Structure formats: structure tokens, C-alpha cells
């Protein structure tokens, strides 16, 4: 079923984006005075922070490219999670039809 493949595909893709985002953030932030997003372990925690849109404020980019990377993370995360919500709807809508005969 498409909605399930998509969900899954969306999860593997998000994990890729997170990892690539941790890498790209450090590359972008290092070199900028006062920057804090400069070691991979925390950067990875930051990407998870961003994609889930929780945004604590303990870490965030300050360079143009860092922020640009941050926007791809947010958007991939929002889109990905929004797709799970959508696939859960197709499951419910499908099951609610069965329960009515159709």
C-alpha cells in the first residue's frame, strides 16, 4: 500500500537528512566566531531538535548556510511527520469504510 511505503520511505529519508544535516551544520558553523553548533554529537541532537520542531534554544545556527541547512531539516521533519499523520488517515478512512460494508 502506497501510504505505508511512503511513510517508511519518509522515515529513512528523514534519518538521512538528520545525519547529513549534522555534518553540514558543523561545516557551516565552524569558522564563525561565537558559534556553538561545532561538534557532531550535539549537532545531531540539534537536528533532531529542529526536525521535530521542538527547538529548545540550547543550540542554533548563526551563519547563512547553517540556517539554510536548518531550514531543510525543519521542512524534512515537518513534511515527514505530516506524512505519517496522512497515512494514518488513509488507514482509518479505509477501515471505516470496511466497517460500513463498502
Amino acid at each position, epitope marked *: 500500500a502506497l501510504h505505508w511505503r511512503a511513510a517508511g520511505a519518509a522515515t529513512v529519508l528523514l534519518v538521512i537528512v538528520l545525519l547529513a544535516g549534522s555534518y553540514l551544520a558543523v561545516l557551516a558553523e*565552524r*569558522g564563525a566566531p561565537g558559534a556553538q553548533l561545532i561538534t*557532531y554529537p550535539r549537532a545531531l541532537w540539534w537536528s533532531v531538535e529542529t526536525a521535530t520542531t521542538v527547538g529548545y534554544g540550547d543550540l542554533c545556527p548563526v551563519t547563512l548556510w547553517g540556517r539554510l541547512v536548518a531550514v531543510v531539516v525543519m521542512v524534512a521533519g515537518i513534511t515527514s511527520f505530516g506524512l505519517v499523520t496522512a497515512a494514518l488517515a488513509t488507514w482509518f478512512v479505509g477501515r471505516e469504510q470496511e466497517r460500513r460494508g463498502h
Partner: antibody
Framework: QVQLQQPGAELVKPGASVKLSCKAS????????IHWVKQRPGHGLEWIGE????????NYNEKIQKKATLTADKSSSTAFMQLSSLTSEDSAVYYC???????????WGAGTTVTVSS | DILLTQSPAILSVSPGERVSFSCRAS??????IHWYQQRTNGSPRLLIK???ESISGIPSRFSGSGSGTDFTLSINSVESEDIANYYC?????????FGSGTKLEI
């Protein structure tokens, strides 16, 4: 085994330029950064800059005059520091170190003693 | 850019005694401080990372503690092999910076 190998010494004439090397062995990750640290006799450690080999980007210390230019050779696992127009101020021991992107210098090289004399 | 203050610059202690090295940051940096040892003629060698984490191949004698702006490197029961220069290094904010150093003396 010796993770970072550096030449023992380099002699340079005021104004001339030298190119120091740092050969790495052992585990190498795409998340590695090579650092260069300058130490004058009797004094402390001074960070010069860093290079991310797997990508090739370099950042430098903004407070001190920029006399360095970092490059790296992915194939031979060698990091290079290009010092130009050296003066007596630039004579010192230059160490290279490897950081795994977690902020601390895991291993340092024996360091190359540079001397700027005529 | 973060300034790491190391004072006193020299520390005199007697054999077997406990010694403590101080390192203060000009702003809060969590536990992003690392300690290096450097003997006469040798290159620096990581002693403690992240203010208090052990490194393999280093006498259980060495420990560290602190968080925020005040950090300590302690040697329980000093001994001649420990005579050297000690530096702290921070990785909280770019660029990484080093302390001016503290010389140990028996």
C-alpha cells in the same frame, strides 16, 4: 603506531616561505579535522587553524596575522600548512593534531621546529 | 572569543601530596573543557576530556571536575613523572582556545 608524522625541522630565510607536512595513519573518518598549533620557546600553545580533509574547508585564527594556508591530500592522508614571508617572529614549534569532531585533540604530532634565520 | 585563565601559573607541592590546577572561563561553557599534559621537549598529551572523563592509558591518579566557568584538574598523590606544563582547552565555542598554562613543581 605513530598516528601523525611530522618533519623534525625546517630552516627558512626571512621573507621566504616553507610548507610543513603531517602524515596520518590509523583510523580515518570523514568527520576528521586536522589542527595546527604554534608554540614559541618558553611560551604556550597557540591555535592556528583547522582543515576538514573529506571536504577540504579551512578556518583560521582571526586575531593573529594570517601567514598560513591549509591544504590536504585525501589519497596520501597528508595535511599541509603553507607559511609565507616568514620573519623571526615565526620561528617556533608547529604541532599538528587530529580531532574527531568532538572538540579535543586526541593525538598530536612530534612537531616541526621551524627556524627563520639568514 | 573564550579566554581560559590558569592561575597560579606555577604550583609547588611535595611528593605524595594532592595537587589541584585551576582553569576559569570568561563565560559558561558547560563541561567542554579538556586537559593536556606536556613534559619538557615532548608534545601535548590528552589527560582528561569533557572536564571529567577518563582517557585510557593515563594513571588512575589523574581526575578532573567542574562545570560552567570553573574547572579543576587534580592529581591525587603527585610524583616526579608528573612534572610538566598543564593546559586546559575549550570546545564550547569557535575558535577552540587554550589556557596560558600551569607548571607543576615537586
Amino acid at each position: 603506531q605513530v598516528q601523525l608524522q611530522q618533519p623534525g625541522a625546517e630552516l627558512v630565510k626571512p621573507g621566504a616561505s616553507v610548507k610543513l607536512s603531517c602524515k596520518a595513519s590509523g583510523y580515518t573518518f570523514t568527520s576528521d579535522w586536522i589542527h595546527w598549533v604554534k608554540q614559541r620557546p618558553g611560551h604556550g600553545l597557540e591555535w592556528i587553524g583547522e582543515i576538514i580533509p573529506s571536504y577540504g574547508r579551512a578556518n583560521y585564527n582571526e586575531k593573529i596575522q594570517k601567514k598560513a594556508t591549509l591544504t590536504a591530500d585525501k589519497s596520501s592522508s597528508t595535511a599541509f600548512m603553507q607559511l609565507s614571508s616568514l620573519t623571526s617572529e615565526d620561528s617556533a614549534v608547529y604541532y599538528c593534531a587530529r580531532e574527531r569532531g568532538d572538540g579535543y585533540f586526541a593525538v598530536w604530532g612530534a612537531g616541526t621546529t621551524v627556524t627563520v634565520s639568514s | 572569543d573564550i579566554l581560559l585563565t590558569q592561575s597560579p601559573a606555577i604550583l609547588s607541592v611535595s611528593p605524595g601530596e594532592r595537587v589541584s590546577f585551576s582553569c576559569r572561563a570568561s563565560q559558561s561553557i558547560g563541561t567542554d573543557i579538556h586537559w593536556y599534559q606536556q613534559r619538557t621537549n615532548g608534545s601535548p598529551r590528552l589527560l582528561i576530556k569533557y572536564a571529567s572523563e577518563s582517557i585510557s592509558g593515563i594513571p588512575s591518579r589523574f581526575s578532573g571536575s567542574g562545570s560552567g566557568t570553573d574547572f579543576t584538574l587534580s592529581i591525587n598523590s603527585v610524583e616526579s613523572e608528573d612534572i610538566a606544563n598543564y593546559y586546559c582547552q575549550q570546545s564550547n565555542r569557535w575558535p577552540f582556545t587554550f589556557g596560558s598554562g600551569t607548571k607543576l613543581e615537586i
